[PDB]
Amino acid sequence: GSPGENLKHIITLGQVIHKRCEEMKYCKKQCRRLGHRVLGLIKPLEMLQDQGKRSVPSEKLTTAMNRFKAALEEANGEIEKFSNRSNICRFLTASQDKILFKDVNRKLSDVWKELSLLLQVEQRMPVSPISQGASWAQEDQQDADEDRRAFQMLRRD
Ligand SMILES: CO[C@@H](c1ccc(-c2ccccc2)cc1)c1nc2ccc(C(=O)O)cc2[nH]1
């Protein structure tokens, strides 16, 4: 059983993702949109986080959060190491990819697809409006372009 502390997990760990950009600098550009987009999932979870009283209505839906929780957990964890100047340097210099948190994002949206489905079916709960899939890469790639000049700018010559 236990209290409704588990629910707060998504609330804290959810926003914690964006909190990183607050301390970051090089990834502050990407993390900016990363957290803003990731917060859209926990946003509608804060309004229900309070209503949560009894134990659990259906473990079926709760199971979606169990995995989802880790989905974003990796985001905040990846941003930490990303802070390394060499990490981003070798990444950009490598010229292999354009995004930085595309992996964690792709899964974050994939897990939410079904998850939100269980939360909406179990009870009136507003889920992310975005398509949750390709739309992510669409904006991530378009915005990632800024990283080009944004990065070069950070390193004054
Ligand atoms: C998944 O992590 C917690 C959680 C958080 C949020 C929801 C939720 C539900 C509806 C709409 C939106 C969100 C559900 C579950 C959680 N897992 C549990 C497992 C067992 C019990 C139990 O009492 O046996 C309670 C649990 N509490």
Nearest to 38 by CA among 119, 133, 108, 91: 108
| DSSP string over 79-106 | HHHHTSHHHHHHHHHHTS-S-SSHHHHH
Q: What is the residue type of 70?
A: A
Q: State the Cα angle at 70 between 66 and 74, rounded to 5°.
A: 175
In this structure, are residues 72 and 17 in contact, taking their beta carbons and an 8 Å threshold?
yes
48 CB near ligand 1 (under 6 Å): yes
- Probe residue for ligand 1, chosen from 50, 51, 62, 118 as the CB with the greatest number of ligand atoms within 8 Å: 62
Structure solved using which method?
Answer: NMR
- Probe residue for ligand 1, chosen from 59, 65, 67, 125 as the CB with the greatest number of ligand atoms within 8 Å: 65
6 CB near ligand 1 (under 6 Å): yes
